[PDB]
Amino acid sequence: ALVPYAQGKSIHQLFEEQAEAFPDRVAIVFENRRLSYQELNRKANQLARALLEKGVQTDSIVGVMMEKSIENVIAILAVLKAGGAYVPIDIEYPRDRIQYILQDSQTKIVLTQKSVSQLVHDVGYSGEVVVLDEEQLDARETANLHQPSKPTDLAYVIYTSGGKPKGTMLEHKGIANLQSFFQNSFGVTEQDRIGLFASMSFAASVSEMFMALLSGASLYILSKQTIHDFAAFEHYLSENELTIITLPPTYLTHLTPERITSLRIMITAGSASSAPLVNKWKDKLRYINAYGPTETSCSATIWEAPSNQLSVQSVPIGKPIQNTHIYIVNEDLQLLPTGSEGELCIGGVGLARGYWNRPDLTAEKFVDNPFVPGEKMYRTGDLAKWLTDGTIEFLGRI
């Protein structure tokens, strides 16, 4: 690789390394409950053994219909450890959207919990259902499994809707690269306390989760109640001394910097209209303006707002992150000089395999990269231009 990362390693192997190195550090917190790395790894290994007995193997698509909880994290790690891919089903979605996704994914096994079991019955799922908080796993072996795995294996499938819902197929490789990117560029260490803002069916939530779990850091799962009340959100971050959070700009605009002291890095996805937000926070923490679709593992470019500088008027999306490439091209995929507007196309290790059972759309969006023969590049449909200082400005849709 151009920039070193843990090549040849799967997501669960990177987690197992952290669990070995920091067994007693806190791994996940949800309300009054918490698990250390060792307790989390042990529980995930027991469930992984049960999943293996049910047929979970390479590229098996395991549906997950669970609350934003510690059990959902155990389920994710267990699916990965068994060698399968997890497909989170957003339990807030209307019944018909869940039914469409279940049918499209063709999943033969759904992992759920007691409080979500009636929803699984109501969506009429006829495959195998494992109710995790009804499964007797406490007697199973707790050691790591060591199932065969390659970084090109499917790790997860994220569904999103814009026509019909489509599943983006993400492999282990991009998340392994993001582990090194977060450690290098965000300074992530085991001392960090990371808030999980997004619900676990969103690709950005999977990314936030592994930003903590692949570095020995703690992940604080923020409840719906904490998020719904701005004062409660500020108090939760302050009480628990959270150091990293990724938020949407529309949520960040309601927060008071004085009420949050502990944050060392804040990541958000905005453009020029977020200049007042950047100017307000850039001097209080490391402000990161990030850009990256699900199709490239939720990361593509970053711009850290220079702190010791006068107010900015424009907010770029920055430069490509390690082992990724950005191209600004015209309709014929020809490169454009500075100042010329074109389509943002992304290459490199974060690229999705494609869209689940959508071969024509996959071929249309993940095209041959003419600049790096033998590789693909993703056509974002986003308009952008290079600035002469070498940063990219986001301009909307093509």
Ligand SMILES: [Cl-]
């Ligand atoms: Cl191993």
